[PDB]
Amino acid sequence: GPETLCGAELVDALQFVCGDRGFYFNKPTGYGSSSRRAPQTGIVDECCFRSCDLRRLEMYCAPLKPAKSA
């Protein structure tokens, strides 16, 4: 069986990785100005439909950071 991430598993990873960073499903990757014809895909069609890498979860994670003692 293939290894994919869908449902709570997908949301769990984003929440477990990004957490309070605020992950986004739709984000640029190639070019959204010169190319007109383009389908809608981000983390679902990329990892749910196809087998991706967990490292991608970090990309969606925002640059901001919550509060912590240091």
Binding site: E3, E9, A13, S51
Partner: peptide, 16 residues
């Protein structure tokens, strides 16, 4: 070991 290796690793890592 590394958590970001497979789809299963993520579950085991979190579900602990």
């Amino acid at each position: 070991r590394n958590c970001f290796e497979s789809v299963a690793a993520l579950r085991r890592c979190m579900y602990g």
